[PDB]
Amino acid sequence: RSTLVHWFRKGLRLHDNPALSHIFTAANAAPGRYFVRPIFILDPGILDWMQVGANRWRFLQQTLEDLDNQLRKLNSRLFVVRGKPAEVFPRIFKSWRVEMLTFETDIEPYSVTRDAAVQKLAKAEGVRVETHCSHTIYNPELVIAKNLGKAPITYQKFLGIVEQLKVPKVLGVPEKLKNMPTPPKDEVEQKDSAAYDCPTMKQLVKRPEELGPNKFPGGETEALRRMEESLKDEIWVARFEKPNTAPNSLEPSTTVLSPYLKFGCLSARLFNQKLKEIIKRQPKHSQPPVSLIGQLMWREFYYTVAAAEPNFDRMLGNVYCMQIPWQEHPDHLEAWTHGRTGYPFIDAIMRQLRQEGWIHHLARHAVACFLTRGDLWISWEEGQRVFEQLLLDQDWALNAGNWMWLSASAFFHQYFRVYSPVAFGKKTDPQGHYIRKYVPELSKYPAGCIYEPWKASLVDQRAYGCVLGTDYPHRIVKHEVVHKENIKRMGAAYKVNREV
Numbered sequence: 348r349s350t351l352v353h354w355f356r357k358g359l360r361l362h363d364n365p366a367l368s369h370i371f372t373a374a375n376a377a378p379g380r381y382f383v384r385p386i387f388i389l390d391p392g393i394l395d396w397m398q399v400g401a402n403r404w405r406f407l408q409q410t411l412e413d414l415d416n417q418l419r420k421l422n423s424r425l426f427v428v429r430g431k432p433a434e435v436f437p438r439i440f441k442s443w444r445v446e447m448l449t450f451e452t453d454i455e456p457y458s459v460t461r462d463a464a465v466q467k468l469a470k471a472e473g474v475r476v477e478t479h480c481s482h483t484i485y486n487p488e489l490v491i492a493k494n495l496g497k498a499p500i501t502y503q504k505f506l507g508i509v510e511q512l513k514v515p516k517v518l519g520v521p522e523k524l525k526n527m528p529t530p531p532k533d534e535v536e537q538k539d540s541a542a543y544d545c546p547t548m549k550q551l552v553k554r555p556e557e558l559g560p561n562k563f564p565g566g567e568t569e570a571l572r573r574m575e576e577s578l579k580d581e582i583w584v585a586r587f588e589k590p591n592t593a594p595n596s597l598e599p600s601t602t603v604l605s606p607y608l609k610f611g612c613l614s615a616r617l618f619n620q621k622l623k624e625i626i627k628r629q630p631k632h633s634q635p636p637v638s639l640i641g642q643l644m645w646r647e648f649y650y651t652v653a654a655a656e657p658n659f660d661r662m663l664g665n666v667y668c669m670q671i672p673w674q675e676h677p678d679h680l681e682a683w684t685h686g687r688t689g690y691p692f693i694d695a696i697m698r699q700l701r702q703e704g705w706i707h708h709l710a711r712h713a714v715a716c717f718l719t720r721g722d723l724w725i726s727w728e729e730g731q732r733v734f735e736q737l738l739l740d741q742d743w744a745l746n747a748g749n750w751m752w753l754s755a756s757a758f759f760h761q762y763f764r765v766y767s768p769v770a771f772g773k774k775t776d777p778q779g780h781y782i783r784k785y786v787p788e789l790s791k792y793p794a795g796c797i798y799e800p801w802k803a804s805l806v807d808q809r810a811y812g813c814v815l816g817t818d819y820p821h822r823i824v825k826h827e828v829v830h831k832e833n834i835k836r837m838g839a840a841y842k843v844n845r846e847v
C-alpha cells in the first residue's frame with residue numbers, strides 16, 4: 348500500500364484546491380490501495396530568509412488548526428512535519444512509499460528553488476508530481492507568454508492581456524474519504540504519537556507579549572465567513588471604489604480578506620467568481636482599477652511582474668526598479684518603525700500595524716511615502732522588511748511591488764505628488780478619532796491641532812497632559828522642508844537613470 352501526499356504551503360484551504368482534490372478522488376476511485384497524507388512542513392529555512400512577527404505566527408497557528416479540523420471532517424487530518432523539505436522528503440518518500448505528490452505552485456524565488464529540488468528528488472525516487480496554479484486567477488507564465496515574453500508593466504496593458512485568457516473552473520471541496528484507515532505509524536510517529544500534530548500557540552509564538560488583539564482569526568473557515576459577510580451588501584460591493592475608502596476609519600473600510608488570500612485560506616478564484624455574480628446582478632457598478640474585481644487584478648498584476656524578476660524585492664539587479672541613492676539613517680528608521688516620528692497620523696498607522704497586523708491601503712501609502720521619497724529618504728527595502736514582520740497579509744510580490752510604486756521606483760513616476768502627513772488623514776477623519784485611539788497620549792488635544800500638536804502652546808500641552816518631547820516625541824523632521832528637498836533628489840535620481 349502506497350501513499351498519496353498533498354503538500355500544503357500556501358493554498359491552505361479545502362475548497363477550490365485542484366491539487367488536493369485530485370489526491371482525494373484518486374484514493375476514492377481506487378479504495379484499499381492508497382494512504383493519504385496531507386502535510387504541511389514547518390520549514391526552518393524560511394526563517395533564514397523572511398521575518399515573521401508574533402501576530403502572523405498566531406494567524407498561521409489558527410490557520411493550521413482550522414485546516415486540520417476541516418480535514419478531519421473528510422476522514423483525514425493534517426500532518427505537520429517539522430524539518431527542512433530537502434531532508435524531509437527523501438525520508439517520507441521511502442517510509443511512506445509515496446506514489447504521487449501534488450502541490451499548488453508558487454512564484455517566489457525561495458519557492459521556485461525549493462520546488463525544483465523536490466521535483467529533482469521525486470523524479471529520482473519515481474514519484475509522480477502534479478502541480479496546479481490556483482494561488483492566482485491567471486497563470487503568470489501564460490500572461491508573460493501572451494505578451495511575447497515580457498510581463499506587462501502597466502495595469503491597463505495587463506488587463507487587456509488577461510481579458511483574452513480562459514478563467515479557470517472553480518472547484519468545490521473534495522469528497523470525503525471512503526474507507527481510509529489511519530495511516531501506519533512511521534519511524535517518527537512511533538517514538539512520538541504527536542510528532543505530526545498541529546503546533547500549539549506556545550510552540551509557534553515565542554514572543555507572546557507582542558501579540559495584539561485577536562481580530563482576524565486565521566483559517567479557511569473564517570475566510571469564507573468573512574467573504575460571505577463582505578458580499579452581503581451587494582450595493583457596497585458593486586459600487587466599491589478603492590480610492591474613496593477611508594484609511595483611518597475605526598472599522599476597516601475594505602474587506603480585510605488580504606491575510607486569507609495571502610495564505611490561500613480564501614481562493615482568489617472563488618472570490619473573483621462571487622464578485623462576478625454580484626456585478627452581473629447590479630447594472631450600476633464600478634470598473635477596474637477602483638472596483639473590487641479591480642483589486643484582485645492588482646494582485647494578479649503584481650504577481651505577474653514579480654514572477655519574471657527573482658530580485659523583485661530589492662533595488663539592486665531589479666529590472667523594474669529605479670536606482671535611487673537612498674540614505675542610511677538608523678535613528679529615523681527606528682522612530683518610523685515604532686511609530687515615534689512625532690507626526691500623529693504617521694504614528695497612529697504604525698502602531699495600528701504593530702498591534703493589529705493590518706492597515707488600510709491608503710494608510711500603507713501614507714507611511715510608505717513618509718519613509719521613502721516623502722520625508723526620511725530611507726530605502727523602500729527597509730520599510731518592506733518592517734511590513735514583512737508586522738503584516739498579517741505579508742506577501743512577497745505585493746509588499747515588494749507596492750513599495751516600489753510608493754517610492755516612485757517603478758510603475759509610478761509622479762514623485763512631485765507627495766502625501767502630507769498632517770493634511771492627508773484630515774479629509775476622512777477631521778476629528779482625529781483614529782489618532783486618539785492609536786496615539787492615546789494625545790487623546791485630549793482638540794481636533795484643531797491633534798494632527799499638529801506642535802501648534803499648541805506649552806501651557807495647553809501641559810493642560811492636555813501630553814508635553815511634546817516628554818510624553819509624545821518632537822517631529823524627527825520638518826515635512827515642509829525635507830519633502831521639497833527630496834523632490835529635487837528624486838529628479839536627480841531620475842536624470843541619472845535616464846542617462847544610463
Ligand SMILES: Cc1cc2nc3c(=O)[nH]c(=O)nc-3n(C[C@H](O)[C@H](O)[C@H](O)COP(=O)(O)OP(=O)(O)OC[C@H]3O[C@@H](n4cnc5c(N)ncnc54)[C@H](O)[C@@H]3O)c2cc1C
Nearest residue numbers: 601602603604605642645646708711740741742745746749
Ligand atoms: C506599501 C504597501 C505594501 C503592501 N503590502 C501588501 C502585502 O504585503 N500584502 C498584500 O496582500 N497587499 C499589500 N499591499 C496592497 C494593499 O495595501 C493591501 O492588499 C490591502 O490594504 C489589503 O486590504 P483589503 O484586503 O481590505 O483590500 P481590498 O481593497 O478589500 O482588496 C481585496 C484584495 O485585493 C488585493 N489588493 C487590494 N489592493 C491591492 C493592491 N494595491 N495591490 C495588490 N493587491 C491588492 C488583496 O488581495 C486584497 O485582499 C500593499 C500596499 C502598499 C502600498
